[PDB]
Curated annotation (Swiss-Prot):
Its main location: cytoplasm. The modification N6-acetyllysine is found at K76. Keywords: Acetylation, Cell inner membrane, Cell membrane, Cytoplasm, Kinase, Membrane, Phosphoprotein, Phosphotransferase system, Sugar transport, Transferase, Transport. It is found in: Cytoplasm; Cell inner membrane. The PTS EIIA type-4 domain is phosphorylated by phospho-HPr on a histidyl residue. Then, it transfers the phosphoryl group to the PTS EIIB type-4 domain. The PTS EIIB type-4 domain is phosphorylated by phospho-EIIA on a histidyl residue. Then, it transfers the phosphoryl group to the sugar substrate concomitantly with the sugar uptake processed by the PTS EIIC type-4 domain. The gene is manX. GO terms for cellular component: cytoplasm; cytosol; membrane; plasma membrane; transmembrane transporter complex. Residues 1-162 form the PTS EIIB type-4 domain. Its EC number is 2.7.1.191. It is an enzyme of class 2 (transferase). This is PTS system mannose-specific EIIAB component. The chain holds residues 159 to 323 of 323 of the full protein.
Length: 165
């Protein structure tokens, strides 16, 4: 707990897109952004582009779930405010199981796909994504769905309760 401070946890299969990362970085007062994804970490070309387009004064990093747990286990970032970028809530539950502390998770956006159910204008969930959200809620973790901080916040459970029931 007296280690890194999670300023915010945003889920988005697009990582950085539009001014979403720019606006959220200034509002979240974040000077560091870490991306957790094994598929992206295996793409050296995408990593170069994300690192070369990192907002001014903001550093973007790319690590895998196993390495992210070790970076957090280093008090070198104690107090430091870092934003976590995920592509699926499954990777969030894995960090929690490793003893990572998360008080709330924010759903930024999820590319829709066949076989999935649309819960929001750009948020899709599969039976696997829903299962991860229910476990986080069972742990007392808050789940909020919102595209921009200027948009009304909706509860992930409420959206899934009107679909799943």
């Amino acid at each position: 707990n007296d280690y890194m401070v999670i300023g915010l946890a945003r889920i988005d299969d697009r990582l950085i897109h539009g001014q979403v990362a720019t606006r959220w970085t200034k509002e979240t007062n974040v000077s560091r952004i870490i991306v957790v994804s094994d598929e992206v970490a295996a793409d050296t070309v995408r990593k170069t582009l994300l690192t070369q387009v990192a907002p001014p004064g903001v550093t973007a990093h790319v690590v895998d779930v196993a390495k992210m747990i070790r970076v957090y286990n280093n008090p070198k970032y104690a107090g430091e405010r870092v934003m976590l970028l995920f592509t699926n809530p499954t990777d969030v539950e894995r960090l929690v199981e490793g003893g990572v502390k998360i008080t709330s998770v924010n759903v930024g956006g999820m590319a829709f796909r066949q076989g999935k159910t649309q819960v929001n204008n750009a948020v899709s969930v599969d039976e696997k994504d829903i299962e991860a959200f229910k476990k986080l809620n069972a742990r007392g973790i808050e789940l909020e769905v919102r595209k921009v901080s200027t948009d009304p916040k909706l509860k992930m459970m409420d959206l899934i309760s009107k679909i799943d029931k």
